[PDB]
């Protein structure tokens, strides 16, 4: 059996780490698993028949310090409405905006949302939009283990209620949210440590009913290939 196939078994739940930044400062972090995915809200609640586990972005303090930009943050949060939904279906992650804040996204590095090429897209309203495909990710991960390419990116960054900060410091944006499917973070780290020699290393997939896997480098690379053979490509 291929333990990595658990990633795509129908009804499996991934863990998503949500980290929010107000003007470049981390203000919130929560890890969420839910069959419905997650939904970023300002808890100006709200509709309980909306889909997705509600993830409430914190109201900034009423402080005199930073009152200007924080009042703008509060305004953005107050206009989130139904919010920003993110969920998985098969090998794809999907997003939809359910309120009035135009939201732009990119798949980027963990520590930098805007590497210079602009957003990958705008999150649609009234229909779903694909924001991540596991297929190319695993292909690129295999290439990475073979010393033939960069580590594949998996951090979804959302710029909420403003234009994407192309050629502008991202820390000036009012509300930036990073979502990391922690299985993908784990898969990349497993590739990094495995290239170091070739004994056994442990990978934790951080998905429902998962158990930490102790694998050799050859075992790991073999499972990635078998996984990719059963996935969909254009």
């Amino acid at each position: 059996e291929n333990p990595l196939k658990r990633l795509l078994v129908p009804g499996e739940e991934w863990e998503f780490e949500v980290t929010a930044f107000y003007r470049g400062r981390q203000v919130f972090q929560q890890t969420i698993s839910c069959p419905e995915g997650l939904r970023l809200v300002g808890s100006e609640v709200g509709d309980r028949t909306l889909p997705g586990w509600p993830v409430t972005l914190p109201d900034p303090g009423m402080s005199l310090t930073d009152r200007g930009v924080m009042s703008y943050v509060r305004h953005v949060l107050s206009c989130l409405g139904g919010g920003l939904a993110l969920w998985r279906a098969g090998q794809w992650l999907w997003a939809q905006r359910l309120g009035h804040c135009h939201t732009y996204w990119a798949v980027s590095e963990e520590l930098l949302p805007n590497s210079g090429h602009g957003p990958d897209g705008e999150v649609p309203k009234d229909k779903e939009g694909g924001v991540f495909d596991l297929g190319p990710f695993i292909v690129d991960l295999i290439t990475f283990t073979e010393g033939s390419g960069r580590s594949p990116r998996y951090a979804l960054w959302f710029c909420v209620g403003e234009s994407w900060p192309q050629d502008q410091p991202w820390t000036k944006r009012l509300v930036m949210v990073k979502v990391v499917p922690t299985c993908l973070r784990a898969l990349v780290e497993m590739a990094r440590v495995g290239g170091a020699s070739s004994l056994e290393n442990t990978v934790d997939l951080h998905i429902s009913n998962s158990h930490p896997l102790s694998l050799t480098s050859d075992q790991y690379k073999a499972y990635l290939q078998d996984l990719v053979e059963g996935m969909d490509f254009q």
């Binding site: 703008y72 953005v76 009035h100 804040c101 135009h102 209620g161 403003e162 234009s163 000036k172 944006r173």
Partner: peptide, 14 residues
């Protein structure tokens, strides 16, 4: 500045 935030803001109306 407030002018820059106002310019970059993208929130549609009800």
């Amino acid at each position: 500045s407030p002018a820059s935030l106002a310019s970059n803001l993208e929130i549609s109306q009800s």
